[PDB]
Every structure is written in C-alpha cells, then in structure tokens.
Amino acid sequence: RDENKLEELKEQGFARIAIANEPPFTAVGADGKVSGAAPDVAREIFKRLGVADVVASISEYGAMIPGLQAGRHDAITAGLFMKPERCAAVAYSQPILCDAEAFALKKGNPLGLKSYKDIADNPDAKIGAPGGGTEEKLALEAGVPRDRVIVVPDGQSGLKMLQDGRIDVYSLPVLSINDLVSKANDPNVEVLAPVEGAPVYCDGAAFRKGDEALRDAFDVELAKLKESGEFAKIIEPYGFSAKAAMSTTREKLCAAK
Ligand SMILES: CC1=N[C@H](C(=O)O)CCN1
C-alpha cells in the first residue's frame, strides 16, 4: 500500500494536495480552481503520471507535515521550503520554487528594521508571520521572544495588522510580499527585500516517508520538465527562477549547513 501508492492515486483519479493560499506559490480562484506555481507544477506531473486531477486542502503551514504524516493528504505542494528538520519528517522531491524572504513595513521604515536581529533588538517591535513558517522560525532564532512573533493566518490579514498597528513588520517570501503589496494599493506600506542575513530557500513537493516510490515517480517527471524547458515555462510567469532551482539539489538544501 506504500509501494503501490501511485496505482491507488491513478485508480482514485486524483491526488490530495496541501496548500496555504499565498500567491504566487498557491492561489484559489473564485470558481475553486487551484493555481499558483506549486499546484501548477504538481498538477502537470500528476497528469503525466496518469492521475487526472489534484484536490487541494487549505491550511496554515504548521498543519501541513502533521496532516501528511497522518495520511490526510498525498503531497504538500505549497512552497514548503526545505530544511534539515523538515527533510527528516518527509520525503521531498528535487527543488522547484526558490525565494528569498521579505518584510512589509511602515513607509520610511521608522524602526529601521532590516534584519530579524533588528526586530530582536527592539523590545517594542512585533513581527507577523505564518504559524509554523520559515519566517517565524527565523524570528525566534534571532532572539525575538515568542510573544513578539505574532501568528498571521494569511497575507490580507497581515497587511491589515500592519496597517492597524498590531504589528510593525509582516514577513513572507519576496514574491508573496510584492504580490500582496501591489494589490493592496497602500502608499503607507513599504517593502524591504531581501531581509538582510536571511537564507534563500527552495521548496519541493513533500511526500509521506513511506511513499518514496511516488516521490521517485514525481521526480522522474520533474527532471524531464526541467530538461525540456517546460519547468521554466510553468514557474517563470509567476516570477520564479528555473535557474535557481536547477542550480541546487534536495541533498544540498537538506544538509546540516
Ligand atoms: C511559500 C512560503 N513558505 C514558508 C515556509 O515554507 O515555511 C512560509 C511562508 N510562505
């Protein structure tokens, strides 16, 4: 049942995927059509594997690995960036979506916040970030106390909290912040990208550890997409660099480094 997971999905007609609704990584249309770069790549590979559709579930990032391990979804296709800790819990594909981290800030950046350390250093500064996300962990690792790292469910709420003064900075990947701010039409909000001292991350699709045969099959198709140039045709309209993903590997991103 673990080694024949692909057969099960093919006979099912669909894979269940976990997403967060954070353009341009993931997005949901009014009609329910899931798109964004991660679901678009995943939908194309699954189709090539003979799985006709993807069925997307929205959750906050902290719920994704748990639900995957619990067998609730078949893959996480959400821009869930690779990290040693995550790599130990799931079977990742090779890299797909790469991005740096950004801040959304008050115009003029009055608190002079340019790094996660800057936030840790100012006891007034509160940062908003998705729960269980890389930004939240980077804030905590820089020494921002738990009570100044504020969980934010989604981008529109993060911007509203920033505008309202409930947080001083909201942090997401560069492409996500730029997309959100450009749609907001708020002259009193300002983007700093990339965050100084922050790592650049890449994601991949994540599978249950026991579903390694499905991960392999997914990876065979991903490699062919990369080789043909079809990979770039899918992700680059969303703002991603195919070169960046193709310059690295799962083992390098997952290494103790
Ligand atoms: C695409 C994205 N990845 C982060 C992560 O993998 O934790 C959370 C904020 N947005």
Q: Which atom of ligand 1 is nearest to the CA of 79?
A: 1
Cβ proximity of 209 and 90 under 8 Å: yes
> Residue 205 and residue 38: Cα distance in Å, rounded?
8
Kindly tell me the burial class for residue 217, based on how many C-beta atoms sit within 10 Å of its own C-beta (0-12, 13-18, 19 or more). buried
Q: Which domains, and CATH codes, for the chain?
A: 8-99+202-242 (3.40.190.10), 100-201 (3.40.190.10)
β partners of residue 92? 206
Kindly tell me the burial class for residue 30, based on how many C-beta atoms sit within 10 Å of its own C-beta (0-12, 13-18, 19 or more). exposed
Does ligand 1 come within 6 angstroms of the Cβ of 92? Answer: no
Kindly tell me the burial class for residue 83, based on how many C-beta atoms sit within 10 Å of its own C-beta (0-12, 13-18, 19 or more). middle
According to the entry, how was the structure determined?
Answer: X-ray
Top mutation candidate among 135, 175, 195 for ligand 1, by most atoms within 8 Å of CB: 135
3-state SS, the chain, equals CCCCHHHHHHHHCEEEEEECCCCCCCEECCCCCEECHHHHHHHHHHHHCCCCEEEEEECCHHHHHHHHHCCCCCEECCCCECCHHHHCCCEECCCCCEECEEEEEECCCCCCCCEHHHHHHCCCCCEEECCCCHHHHHHHHCCCCHHHEEECCCHHHHHHHHHHCCCCEEEEEHHHHHHHHHHHCCCCEEEECCCECCCCEEECCEECHHHHHHHHHHHHHHHHHHHHCHHHHHHHHHCCCHHHHHCCCHHHHHCCC
Task: Select from 151, 147, 144 the least CA-distant residue to 170.
Answer: 151
Q: How far is the CA of 4 from the centre of ligand 1 (A)?
A: 30
Q: How far is the CA of 89 from the centre of ligand 1 (A)?
A: 16
> Residue 109 and residue 135: Cα distance in Å, rounded?
19
Tokens of 98: 């790469």
